Each structure stands twice: as structure tokens, then as C-alpha cells.
Design a binder for this molecule. Structure first.
Ligand code: MYY
Ligand code: MYY
Ligand code: HQN
Ligand code: CL
Ligand code: FE
Lengths: 256, 256
């Protein structure tokens, strides 16, 4: 689109060139940068690397604060074609003895006023206790597991159980890992989270994630994605052997 | 941990983050970028694209103007290992019936004091008429074509023969070319240039380029790397009833 790209480019160009000058970026520097950017290309990191530092912001622009439910970063992990789920307590598809703490999510889907949005479909997915997002892991089938679509009751409410997601270290060994881990000498962890997308004819898509109080990497997310409005109050319930974690959330929507 | 790296990178990201924001960079735009960035690596174009937009700027910090020869950007197409050329007249390795006007290059290398620098070796590389560089074109073989190393005579003069470069167009079909030609509605032409590198014990290495007077793209370089001081007159002075191009430059080197 010619005129828009023309605008941004030139301004982008000047921005970097000015960055190069003010910091007298030398040739070996240039060369390391270029080398590095090649690295990222050579592995599959661009959506990873870009989503890590920049989408939080591409996000803040696209949907922006206010009394909706706040969006959050989509991530390089979504997968279309999730199953419609409808069972006893409507569970995410998971292996047997999928490990560690069991989880319960409860909530609403109402519009500005507060009137339940019946025609909502609602995708959700999240990483195994073990840091792996199926479809993106040698360890895991290329199937629907901890992924799935859920419909709201006409009363408003929704429910699903899954397992409790936990802190994920982005590949220590990736260009992004090295950048986060070694050169910047910080860490490659995100807080425990659950990604969520919500369609509805006649409203505006929403895409967000939720995290957990007492989450050690809340203040320090690698991907600077955590808004506070989206940290989950967490009830640790001990239904014998299997310790459960229950969580509640009320979604409100854009509404075209 | 790298504090240069810490400091530049944080600023780098805050800028980009600023940039995204003031310009309302929308998700679809974001993705097109990512898609672009990716397709740049796939075309192995980082060192193309990057040098085209930024090497001019890195060049100007990390080497200064003065009574020695002005440097210029290296570009993506340098190769280490070109052969020493020693000859009746030294001649760059060239395919049979290699298309273009026969060019004859003369000059010298001396120091800021006037003394010939007899210990210098001069790398030279330029494109084929056809606008291709060896080792960087699937249309030429990975062998040293139109690359070689000349050394000056005891009296410090240099001479090589070769074909005379012509204006070069970054392939319109690349991601880089597509950006420049289509997306920005500009062109992607550089003027005929000869890349030079001089190294010599005692001296700071020089990498530069030589342009030709009249060169139609002179006032309009895609990479925007021409410098008036580096535009050689061309003397079309014929011999054996055949059409030579005569070009002469005197190199001057800084000490250390
Ligand atoms: C060390 C420096 C780092 C180098 C960073 C490279 C930054 C990536 C360069 C982005 C180039 C933008 C791609 C141009 C758009 C395109 O290729 O598709 C054209 C498309 C079809 O025409 P209808 O036009 C569009 O509608 C897409 C609009 C995209 C706007 C491009 C703005 C570029 C801003 C760059 C930095 C932002 C981060
Ligand atoms: C449109 C988005 C474009 C995103 C591209 C950003 C590229 C990220 C650059 C990160 C480079 C990683 C540097 C590797 C550190 C390293 O190799 O340490 C050892 C060695 C000594 O390398 C160095 O420490 C030399 C210092 C390198 C300084 C680069 C700092 C990054 C500044 C952002 C680039 C803006 C242009
Ligand atoms: O950025 C560039 C592109 C093409 C060239 O021939 C060159 O020397 C530099
Ligand atoms: Cl060598
Ligand atoms: Fe995730």
C-alpha cells in the first residue's frame, strides 16, 4: 500500500540512521547485528522474537484500555479448527494423567450493559505443565490437546476444566534465548498463563491471556505482556490427592 | 551480559515501541512486516537490504574525512581469498567473451606523506554487465570472477585491466527490490562502481568504491553511497583500433 508504507519507512529509516549515528555503531557492531538477525531467520524465530518484544504494543494500539475486557498478545501459538466441547463439565482434550494441579475456570460473557452474549464461541489453549504447546512440540502429538472451543450458557456463564498451566521458559538455546538469557543477561521465562480468543457474530473479536497471583514472573515477563487487570485471584482447593486450582473471570465485549 | 548491548537494545525497543504507537501500527500491518522480515531471510537478503538502507550511516561514523581517501560502504558482495593477479597487464578473472567495454585502471597507493605504500594489496570486485556478482548469484558459479588482488609496483603504481562496470539493479524480484521498486515506487539502481579494499602493514585498511562521471544514477543511488570525491573521469582513449575505457585513481592511506 504505497503511501502508508512510504510514510513509515522513511520515518523508520531516519529513526535507525539517527540511532546508528548517536551511538557511533561501528562496523563490527553492524556486522554482529546483521549476523544476529540472520541467526533468528535461520531458526524459526521471527514471530517468536517479534511477538516477544513488540506485540504487547501492537496490541495496546489495536484495542486499547477501557471497560471492555482488556485484550492481550495473541502469541505465536494459536491453532484454528479446535474442537467444539460439550461434555459433563466440558473438559479440554488432554492425555491421561496429564500432570500436576487440576484447574477450574468459571466466568461470564456479557456486553457493555451486562446482557449475556449467547452467540459467543470461545477458543482457548495453553501450554502443558511441562512448557510445551502441542502443534509446536516434538514431545507432543500434532493434535488438539489443551486446546478447545467452548460455548456459553444462555444464562451468560461458562466453564471448563484443564490442568494448571505454569511458567514457560522460551528456548534457552534460541537466538531469542541467547539475547534474553546471555547478552541481555536476564531470563527467558513467561508467567503461567492461558490464552483465550472469543468470536461472536455482531461483536468484535477479542484475544487475551490470564495469569496467576503469586506468579513469580509477573513483574518481569520476557514478553512484557502482563496487564494487572488480567491477573487471576487463585483459590487453592485440596480435593484430596489431586490439589485443584479454581479461577473465575468475567468477559465484557467490544460490541462493534 | 553486555552493557553496550544492554543500553542500545533497551533504547532500541522503547523507540520501536514509541514508533508503533504514534503511527498506529495495526496487527495486520505488524503481520505483513513479520511476513516481510521472514521472506527477507528466506531470500538470504539481510546483508543486501541492510547495507542498502544503513551502511552509508555506519560508514560515516567509523571513518573520517581528511587528506586521505574517503571510504565507502563495503556492500554485501565482498569475498575473502581473491587471487593475486600478476600479468603482462594484470587482468581480473573473467569468463570468455565476458560482455562489456574493456576498462583499464591505473593509479597508485601512497601515504599522507606522499611515499608509495609498496606493501599494500588491493582487493577489487565489481558486477558483471549483467548486474551479477560471483559467489552471490545462482546465475554465476562460486568462483573468483571479476575479483582479484592487485599489488603495486616497486614505485607504488597500480594497473589492472578488466570490463567496465555498468549500473546495477537490485533484483526487482527480491524482497528488497520489491520494497524499493513496487512498495516504495522508487527504483533499485546503483551506478557502475568498482569496490576497492586496501590493507597494508602500518596502515588503517580502506574500503571504498569508484564511480564514473556521467553515470546516470550518480545523483540517485539506491543505497545512496556516492561521494563527489570518488567519481572518476572516464577517458575513452582507443588502442589497436579498439575501444578502451581508461580510469585512474590515486589512493592515499592513513597510518596506524
Ligand atoms: C537494524 C535495523 C532493523 C531492520 C528492521 C527491518 C524492518 C522491517 C521493514 C518492514 C518493511 C515493510 C514491508 C512493506 C509492506 C509490504 O511489503 O507489503 C505491501 C502491502 C501490499 O500493498 P496493498 O502494503 C500494505 O498494505 C501493508 C502496509 C505495511 C506498512 C509497512 C510499514 C513499515 C514500518 C517498519 C518498522 C515497524 C516495526
Ligand atoms: C523491526 C525489528 C527489527 C529487530 C532487529 C533487532 C536486532 C537485535 C540486535 C541484537 C543483536 C544481538 C547482539 C549479540 C551480542 C553478542 O554477540 O555479544 C558478543 C559480541 C562482542 O557482540 C557485541 O556485544 C557487540 C555489541 C553489539 C551491539 C548491538 C546492540 C543491539 C542494538 C539494537 C540494534 C539497532 C540497530
Ligand atoms: O548495497 C549494495 C548493493 C549492491 C552493490 O553492488 C553494493 O556494492 C552494495
Ligand atoms: Cl585470505
Ligand atoms: Fe503462550
Amino acid at each position: 500500500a504505497n503511501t502508508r508504507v512510504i510514510e513509515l519507512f522513511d520515518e523508520f529509516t531516519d529513526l535507525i540512521r539517527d540511532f546508528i549515528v548517536r551511538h557511533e555503531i561501528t562496523t563490527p557492531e553492524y556486522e554482529t547485528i546483521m549476523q544476529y538477525m540472520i541467526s533468528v531467520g535461520e531458526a524459526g524465530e521471527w514471530p517468536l522474537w517479534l511477538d516477544a518484544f513488540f506485540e504487547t504494543t501492537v496490541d495496546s494500539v489495536s484495542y486499547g484500555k477501557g471497560n471492555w475486557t482488556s485484550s492481550a498478545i495473541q502469541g505465536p501459538f494459536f491453532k484454528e479448527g479446535a474442537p467444539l466441547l460439550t461434555g459433563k463439565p466440558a473438559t479440554l482434550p488432554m492425555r491421561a494423567d496429564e500432570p500436576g494441579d487440576r484447574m477450574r475456570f468459571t466466568g461470564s460473557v456479557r456486553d457493555t450493559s451486562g446482557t449475556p452474549i449467547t452467540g459467543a464461541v470461545i477458543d482457548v489453549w495453553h501450554s502443558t505443565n511441562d512448557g510445551n504447546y502441542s502443534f509446536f512440540s516434538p514431545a507432543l502429538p500434532d493434535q488438539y490437546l489443551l486446546r478447545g472451543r467452548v460455548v456459553p450458557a444462555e444464562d451468560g456463564s461458562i466453564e471448563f476444566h484443564s490442568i494448571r498451566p505454569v511458567p514457560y521458559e522460551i528456548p534457552k538455546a534460541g537466538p531469542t534465548g541467547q539475547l534474553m538469557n546471555s547478552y541481555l543477561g536476564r531470563h527467558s521465562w513467561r508467567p503461567a498463563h492461558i490464552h483465550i480468543r472469543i468470536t461472536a457474530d455482531g461483536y468484535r473479536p477479542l484475544i487475551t491471556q490470564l495469569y496467576f497471583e503469586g506468579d513469580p514472573y509477573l513483574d518481569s515477563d520476557s514478553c512484557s505482556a502482563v496487564k494487572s487487570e488480567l491477573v487471576l485471584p487463585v483459590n487453592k482447593i485440596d480435593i484430596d490427592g489431586e490439589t485443584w486450582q479454581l479461577v473465575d473471570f468475567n468477559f465484557i465485549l467490544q460490541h462493534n
